Design a protein around this nucleic acid. Structure first.
Ligand SMILES: Cc1cn([C@H]2C[C@H](O)[C@@H](COP(=O)(O)OP(=O)(O)OP(=O)(O)O)O2)c(=O)[nH]c1=O
Ligand SMILES: [Cl-]
Ligand SMILES: [Mg+2]
Ligand SMILES: [Mg+2]
Length: 698
DNA sequence: GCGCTTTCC
RNA sequence: UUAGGAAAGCGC
């Protein structure tokens, strides 16, 4: 193992910088591969550092209550358990082909495929090295990320040749197959049971650099491969999309006169560990992923092994015949791609009936391995779901974790309820289901009780178990309390009573003063109001936003007469209007009002006219021009008049040319309006809205 | 752009 | 001997 303190020494740094250069001159131009040369180099750098210098598992309990405190017996039991877990690779290759051919799967085009097979560059390697985390343990070879950062200039030309030889032969250095497994406890589980540990992998930094490059390449096309129902590990997606969608679906069932529904929360057992490698490679081929990229993935999964590090010892290696390492940057994407085969199958199987919410059919919400399935007529639909999952399990290794899976079941009588319960492997919850850190409730009326009441109590528990200045104590509230509170608001932005904030302010101020500060009321307002950004963007992926019992919620538009039983949108709207009132802003007809708006549609204008104006001139009424500027700001606008229906042109001129329209639309937009209209990304919305709310309410 | 924490898996 | 991925915030 490398001591990072040695890299700080001028004499060691110069002696090493020269030894690296002297190795690649003496040993290059020999009867050897770049793969074996790299491994020999690491072995030589290792010995040169030695010459220059010249977490406990105490008890394991079985299913019968017998324990062992013997280090050898604990090591044997643990090693035998993990060895068996990763031992059995499936051989039913024809059945894998059959399942994959059964459903319609996406496929990368030649442009996307060439982007994956694009040769690795030195600048690609450099950027990864620069972003490597510091103060972390090395992999089994002993080299920390700091070794690669310190000798970047000398190593990158060599790493590039190594990676170029890997992309030619599909052969890796032997060390690229090694990893250390560290066993970490799973929160709140019994730590005396061997199955309640999470096996975390520490791979060598050189292999992690290659894997991060491969992960970055496929992540560029992940939106094409994964349907928007999956938000776990996906860039630009939020877990609260699934939470709010699930809650509106529960409210729909609550309001339905005919109960014949089921909401199933399925967790996969040891999700990354049980992935079948031949099924994963076949799935990548099915999506068009082939060539150089595929060859490298295949080489990575050829003969990986693991050495468990337990109680001062490095245990004998075992092969990883199953799974993708927890700790490898490629693993989240390859897992999601495999699970996506099941997700496509569920959505495509009409005999697995989803919940119809008007024109929206809801059926699935995914967050990494967690699936929420929304079913109608579960006596048939849940049985077809379990059958499909069983067939996927046979080819992929997928397994339902029965102890972590639960369902809400809604029927009209006890007879159908018992008939359904008796045919399912997981339990029926009668009050709540923990999902993404929050409690989904069987009846949406219990949301405040099961989420915000426990939150106030757990914040008192954080301040009780917490030698610090009042300035440092304000930072503890900001670092640890604030994210828990914002997370809950984002998940369930329901109307909260003032009493919630009064008690939250009391618990917080007492902790700071021992019996800028975060304004929890303004963070709440920012989070609630933030939803209006999604209303304006009107994205196809935002199905969560189209699940309320409702008369559209639109900003920068003429409001409708107006639902009454809205959990989130009505409350968002009321906050939006109150903030606009405080800003002395007319928010109904503005420079950001769209051409496709109630303002234009109420003139009885044709949708073809709206489309013609959008495709030729832009998206807002301001783009087409108001007053003297009406369809005359550019030669393109003047000519576009000839493509518009004669009657609609007169209606539009009458509206756009009116004095009231001209004053409201041709004005200058405020900072507040720009936050909600001019940003194509939703990143940092709470920070930007909160910052504006401070400059208005303080 | 750098750094730090938190939520989820 | 705590890795990884996405997301959120705080901060100069
Ligand atoms: C919690 C967690 C998950 N993951 C990945 C790998 C996991 O297999 C996957 C799903 O996480 P989990 O569902 O939390 O765990 P699991 O599926 O491994 O095991 P269990 O049977 O207890 O459900 O997400 C990490 O890489 N690191 C983590 O810290
Ligand atoms: Cl027209
Ligand atoms: Mg997509
Ligand atoms: Mg799981």
């Amino acid at each position: 193992k490398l001591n990072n303190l040695l890299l700080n020494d001028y004499w060691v740094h110069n002696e090493m910088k020269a030894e690296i250069k002297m190795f690649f001159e003496t040993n290059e131009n020999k009867d050897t591969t770049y793969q074996n040369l790299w491994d020999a180099f690491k072995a030589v750098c290792r010995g040169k550092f030695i010459a220059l210098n010249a977490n406990q598992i105490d008890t394991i309990k079985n299913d019968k209550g017998d324990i062992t405190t013997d280090p050898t017996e604990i090591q044997t039991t643990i090693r035998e358990y993990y060895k068996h877990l990763y031992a059995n690779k499936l051989e039913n290759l024809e059945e894998m082909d059959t399942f994959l051919d059964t459903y319609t799967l996406p496929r990368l085009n030649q442009e996307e495929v060439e982007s994956l097979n694009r040769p690795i560059t030195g600048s690609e390697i450099v950027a990864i090295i620069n972003s490597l985390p510091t103060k972390k343990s090395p992999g089994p070879d002993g080299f920390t990320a700091e070794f690669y950062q310190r000798y970047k200039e000398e190593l990158v030309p060599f790493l590039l040749k190594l990676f170029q030889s890997i992309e030619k032969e599909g052969i890796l250095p032997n060390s690229f197959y090694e990893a250390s497994i560290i066993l970490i406890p799973k929160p709140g589980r019994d730590t005396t049971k061997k199955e309640n540990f999470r096996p975390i992998s520490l791979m060598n930094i050189d292999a992690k650099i290659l894997n991060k490059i491969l992960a970055n390449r496929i992540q560029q096309h992940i939106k094409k491969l994964i349907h928007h129902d999956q938000v776990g590990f996906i860039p630009g997606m939020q877990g609260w999309f699934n939470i709010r969608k699930s809650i509106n679906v529960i409210q729909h069932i609550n309001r339905a006169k005919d109960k014949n529904h089921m909401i199933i929360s399925i967790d996969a057992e040891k999700a990354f560990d049980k992935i079948q490698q031949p099924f994963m490679l076949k799935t990548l081929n099915k999506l068009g992923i082939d060539g150089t990229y595929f060859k490298i993935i295949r080489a990575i999964y050829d003969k990986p092994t693991a050495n468990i590090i337990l109680n001062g010892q490095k245990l004998e290696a075992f092969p990883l015949k199953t799974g993708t390492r927890q700790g490898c940057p490629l693993s989240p994407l390859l897992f999601n791609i495999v699970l996506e085969v099941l997700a496509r199958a569920i959505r495509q199987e009409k005999e697995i009936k989803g919940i119809q919410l008007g024109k929206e059919e809801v059926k699935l919400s995914l967050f990494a391995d967690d699936m929420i399935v929304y079913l109608e007529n579960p006596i048939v639909s849940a049985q077809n779901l379990l059958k499909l999952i069983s067939n996927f399990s046979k080819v992929s290794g997928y397994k339902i974790n029965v102890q972590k899976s639960q369902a809400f079941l809604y029927t009209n009588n006890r007879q159908t309820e018992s008939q359904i319960m008796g045919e399912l492997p997981f339990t029926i919850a009668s009050k709540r289901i923990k999902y993404l850190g929050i409690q989904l409730t069987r009846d949406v009326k219990d949301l405040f009780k099961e989420n915000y009441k426990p939150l106030l109590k757990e914040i008192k528990e954080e301040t009780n178990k917490w030698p610090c200045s009042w300035v440092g104590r304000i930072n503890i509230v900001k670092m640890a309390i604030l994210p828990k509170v914002i997370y809950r608001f984002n998940a369930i932005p329901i109307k909260l009573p003032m009493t919630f904030f009064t008690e939250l302010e009391k618990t917080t101020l007492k902790f700071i003063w021992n019996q800028t500060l975060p304004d929890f009321k303004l963070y709440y307002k920012a989070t609630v109001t933030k939803t209006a950004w999604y209303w304006y963007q009107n994205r196809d992926i935002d199905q969560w936003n189209r699940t309320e019992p409702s008369y559209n919620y639109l900003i920068f538009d003429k409001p409708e007469k107006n639902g009454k039983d809205s959990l989130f949108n009505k409350w968002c709207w009321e906050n939006w209007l109150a903030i606009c009132r405080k800003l002395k802003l007319d928010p109904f007809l503005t420079p950001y009002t769209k051409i496709n708006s109630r303002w234009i549609k109420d003139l009885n204008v044709k949708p073809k006219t709206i489309k013609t104006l959008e495709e030729n001139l832009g998206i807002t009424i301001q783009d087409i021009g108001v007053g003297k500027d009406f369809m005359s700001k550019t030669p393109k606008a003047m000519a576009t008049k000839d493509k518009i229906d004669k009657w609609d042109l007169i209606k539009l001129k009458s509206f756009c040319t009116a004095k009231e329209t001209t004053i409201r639309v041709n004005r200058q937009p405020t900072t507040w309006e720009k936050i909600f209209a001019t940003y194509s990304s939703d990143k940092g919305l709470i920070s930007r809205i909160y910052n504006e709310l401070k400059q208005i309410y303080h």
